[PDB]
Structure formats: C-alpha cells, structure tokens
Amino acid sequence: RLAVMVLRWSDGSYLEDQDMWRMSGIFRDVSLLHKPTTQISDFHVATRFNDDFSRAVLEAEVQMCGELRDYLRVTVSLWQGETQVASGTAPFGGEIIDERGGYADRVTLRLNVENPKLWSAEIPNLYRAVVELHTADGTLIEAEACDVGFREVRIENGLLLLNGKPLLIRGVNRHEHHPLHGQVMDEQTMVQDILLMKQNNFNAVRCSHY
Amino acid sequence: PNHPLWYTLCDRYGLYVVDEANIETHGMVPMNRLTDDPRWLPAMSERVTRMVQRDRNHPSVIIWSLGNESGHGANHDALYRWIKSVDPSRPVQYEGGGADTTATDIICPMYARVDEDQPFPAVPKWSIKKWLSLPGETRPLILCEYAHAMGNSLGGFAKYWQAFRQYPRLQGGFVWDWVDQSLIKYDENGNPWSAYGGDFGDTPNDRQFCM
Ligand SMILES: [Mg+2]
Ligand code: NA
Ligand code: NA
C-alpha cells in the first residue's frame, strides 16, 4: 500500500505563479521501475559535425552505479531502422580530469557517422541509440535507449543556426490544458495538437512555462 | 577639397565638414577599374595625402572621405589605412563598392531608402533600418547622399527624420544637394535665363540632372 499526501500549497508555489488555472493533485503518470543493482544511472548523447555536416561524431557519456569491475562494458550502438550504422564498446574509466584521477564509474563512447541524416522540423530524421551495460563476454545487464537527431544548434554572427542555416521560428506557446481533465495530458490530445500545429505551418513550440 | 576659405568659415560659423578627396571614376566599367589598379595608386594617393596635409588643422573637418563613386579597389583600402595612421582623430568614410566595405568607418550609403530594400547585385542598397542590424554589422550609418532634391522633390523627407530620431545608430545624412548647377545664358534682349545640360551645344549631356 502506497499513501501519498499531496499539498495544494507549498513554498514551491512561490515559484509557480504562471498565468493559468491553479489546480493540484497527482496529475501525471505514476510508475514502478525495476533496475539492476549494477545499473546505468545516467547517459548523455552529443552530436558534433564538420563544417559541411557530411561527417559526425556521436559522443555518449554513460554513468553507472553499483560495484566497479574490470569485466564491465558499455556498448553504444546506433541504428537507422533495422540497420546498425555505428557501434562502440569500452570498459569503464574516464580520462584523467584532475590531480585525483578520473571517473572510474564513467565512460565516453565516440561513434563516427559518415553523411548523417540530419534532424530538423522539416525532416525529422532520427536514429536509435541503444546503450547496453554488459560483461566483457557479452552478457547483458540492462539496456537503455533514446531517439537521436543529428543536428547542431548555434548562434553565429548574431544568427540562430540549425545545421548551419538561419532558422525562422513559426512558434506558438502551448500550455498543458484539457477542458475536461484540466492539466492531465494524454497521448491523443498531444498528437492532435502537433498535427494541427504542423497543418497550420508551425515549426516550433515553447513549453510555457514548465 | 574646397576653396581653403570654406573651412575657415565652417570653423568660425560652426558646421561639421566631411572633407573629400578629389577622386571620382564613376564612368569606368566596372567602377573600380582604376581604383583596383596599382598603377593608379600613386595618382590616387596624392589626392588623399595632400588633402590631409592641407586641411588636418581645421576643427570643422570631422570626417575624411576617400572620394566618390569609384567602386571599391585595393587602392582605397591602402589609403584608408594611410589616413588612420597619420590622423587617428577623424573617422574615414567612403561609399563606393556598397557603402559598408572595409574602407569605411561609417556605413554611408547614397539614396538607401528608409523601409524599402533595393537588392541590387553586388552593391545592394538595404533599407537603412535593416542595414544597421545585418549579421555582424556594428557601425553607425550616415547617408552620404539622400533625398535627391531635383525639381519638385523631397517627398518622404519626414520618413528619414522619423527613422533618424528613433534609431540611435541612424545618425542622419547629407541631402543631395545644396544648390542647382544651372548656368546663366542671355536671350536677344540681354535678358538672363537659367540653362542646364545641352544648352551650350554640349553633347552628350544629361539635361536637367545638374539641378
Ligand atoms: Mg505571468
Ligand atoms: Na539616431
Ligand atoms: Na546631378
């Protein structure tokens, strides 16, 4: 039995003065997650490019919790459909960062991608990154994953550039609102919103304000 | 460069002066044919250096100009840098080659409009408001020529001044121009009349464009 005592008002409310209906409760999903004792505790994916975006390096930093062991490995593999496009495997132990050494519980994988399919609102090309925590011998402990979009966002010479090209933001602010369910969001309503947005020539959304 | 008395009068009465080298090669094709040619650098250099040597002590002179309508050539860059070295006290401007080249401290277009772009190939005349904020652009903008007062004209003059007052980096301009270049001719009775291009048998000519 779980017992949850939810308060409508708190010191947190002083930072939650958005122009919207003030409601309360358990208004998003509740779930139970089982992880192994030795687990992936964090991972960051970065994509860096050469000048004409014909080459990319996917960089994946992976963190573990649990007992550190020489046999532990991380493989990050990149997939386009059912085709594996790149893969990298390494034992734990980051490079030296200061006088006390490095992170024994971290590893950075670097995967080369030639002529990556680039992500934008125009063409949302995605790859799948799978992060496997496993033994040297290849016994899986657990896998996490995410969708990867190869894109670079930067400001240069006073312009916001996506993949080297200046964006024109056809944006809209969107609150999480349903007239029946209040501030509870469902997949159907989210999808309806996205379809309508794109059908009406929007390419951008601001999560106003959370 | 003007008659030397002009600068003394401007010193004493109080007018800001742009002193401009006697260099204009407008009729060349392309306009920078001579100014990009190192064989014309000696001739151009003397028109710039001797002006500076003559006029540098006049307080009314606040800006040096490399000349007018001569495209943008390597000779301009060289003479721009010469002035900057010998007289750091005055900015240098030059409109040729698109009004915002490396030979100018001031974006100094001629007849750029307030709101309307004129996107000519190679040498566009952007809306002056737009010009200021082009990616990487930081310089002040002062039109070297604007509001062409030919005949019944100066329509839209207020639009410039509204913009000048609203935008800090729009710092004004020089109207084209002060005085009609008409000449006196006389009829059979000795009565004077104002003449323009072509009235002297001069041909080819550009008719009333001198006024
Ligand atoms: Mg508010
Ligand atoms: Na101004
Ligand atoms: Na004229």
The DSSP output letter for A183 is: T
Length of chain B: 211
Closest CA to B133 of B100, B110, B159: B100
Q: Which residue of B has its CA nearest to A159?
A: B135
Report the length, in residues, of chain A: 210
Breaks (C-N over 2.5 A) in chain B follow: none
Q: Give residue for tokens 């008719």.
A: B207
Distance CA B173, CA B164 (A): 9
Are B106 and B63 in contact by the 8 Å Cβ rule? The answer is yes
The technique by which this structure was obtained is X-ray
Angle CA(B80)–CA(B85)–CA(B87) in degrees, nearest 5? Answer: 90
Q: How far apart are CA A79 and CA A74, in angstroms?
A: 16
Distances (CA, A) of A113 to A51, A75, A145, B66, B169: 14, 16, 18, 52, 46
- Residue A118 C-alpha, separation from nearest chain B C-alpha, in angstroms: 25
> A19 CA distance to ligand 1 centroid (A)?
5
Domain that holds residue A101: 37-151
Cβ neighbours of A157 in B, within 8 Å: 135-136
Distance CA A119, CA A127 (A): 9
Long-range contacts formed by A38-41: CB under 8 A, 24+ apart: A38/A64, A38/A65, A38/A66, A38/A67, A38/A69, A38/A72, A38/A133, A38/A141, A39/A64, A39/A65, A39/A66, A39/A133, A39/A141, A39/A142, A40/A64, A40/A74, A40/A131, A40/A133, A40/A142, A40/A144, A41/A65
Mutation target to probe the B interface, by most B beta carbons within 10 A, among A154, A155, A157 is A157
Q: Which helix (H) or strand (E) segment is A192 a member of? A: helix A187-199
- The pair of three-digit structure tokens given for residue A153, joined into one six-digit string: 């966002």
Q: Which amino acid is at B203?
A: T
CA distances (Å), B144 to each of B108, B156, B208, in order? 5, 17, 22
**Residue B155 contacts residue B148 (beta carbons within 8 Å):** no
Nearest ligand by distance to the CA of B111: 3
Beta strands B170-175 and B141-146 are parallel
Task: Give the integer Cα–Cα distance in Å for B127 and B118.
Answer: 7
Q: Are B145 and B174 in contact (CB under 8 A)?
A: yes
Interface size between A and B, measured as CB pairs under 8 A: 6
Q: What is the DSSP letter of A165?
A: E
| Sign for the pseudo-dihedral over CA of B120, B122, B124, B129 | positive
Q: Which ligand is nearest to the CA of B141?
A: 2
Catalytic residue numbers of B, as ranges: 69, 145
How close B194 comes to chain A (CA, Å)? 53
Nearest CA in chain A to B133: A158
Contact B171, B140 (CB under 8 A): yes
Closest CA to B137 of B105, B167, B113: B105
Identify the domain containing residue B13 by its residue range.
1-211
Q: How far is B136 from chain A (nearest CA, A)?
A: 5
Question: Which residues 36-75 in chain B show a CB within 8 A of chain A?
Answer: none
* Kind plus residue range of the DSSP H or E element containing A156: strand A153-156
Q: CATH number of the domain that A121 lies in?
A: 2.60.40.10
Which residue type, as a one-letter code, is found at position B94? Y
Task: Decide if B37 contacts B82 (C-beta within 8 A).
Answer: no
CATH number for the domain spanning B54: value is: 3.20.20.80
Do A38 and A64 touch, CB atoms closer than 8 A? Answer: yes
Q: Which residue of B has its CA nearest to A155?
A: B135
CA distances from residue A38 to A69, A133, A141, B67 in whole angstroms, order as listed = 10, 9, 8, 76
Q: How far apart are CA B211 and CA B209, in angstroms?
A: 5
How many domains, in total, are found in chain B?
Answer: 1
User: A160 — contact with chain B (CB < 8 Å)?
Assistant: no
Residues 133-172 of chain B whose Cβ lies under 8 A from any Cβ of chain A: 133, 135-136
Kindly identify the ligand whose nearest atom is closest to the C-alpha of B143: 2
Other Cβ atoms closer than 10 A to A3? 4
How many other C-beta atoms lie within 10 A of the C-beta of residue B77?
17
What is residue A187's DSSP assignment?
H
Judged by a CB distance cut-off of 8 A, whether residue A159 touches chain B is yes
Resolution (A): 1.9
User: Does residue A131 contact residue A74 with C-beta atoms inside 8 Å?
Assistant: yes
Residue ranges for the known binding site of A for substrate are: 19
Residue B37's alpha-carbon distances to A91, A158, B71, in angstroms, are 64, 35, 12
Helix (H), strand (E), coil (C) string for chain B: CCCCHHHHHHHHHCCCEEEECCCCCCCCCCCCCCCCCHHHHHHHHHHHHHHHHHHCCCCCEEEEECCCCCCCCHHHHHHHHHHHHHCCCCCEECCCCCCCCCCCCCECCECCCCCCCECCCCCCECCHHHHHCCCCCCCCEEEEEECCCCCCCCCCHHHHHHHHHHCCCEEEEEECCCCCCCEEEECCCCCEEEECCCCCCCCCCCHHHHC
Measure the CA–CA gap between B14 and B142, rounded to whole angstroms.
19
8 A C-beta contact, residue A133 and residue A72: yes
Residue A27's region, left for phi above 0, alpha for psi from -120 to 50, else beta, is: alpha
Token output for A26: 């358990």
Q: Determine if residue A19 is left, alpha or beta; phi over 0 gives left, psi from -120 to 50 gives alpha, anything else beta.
A: beta
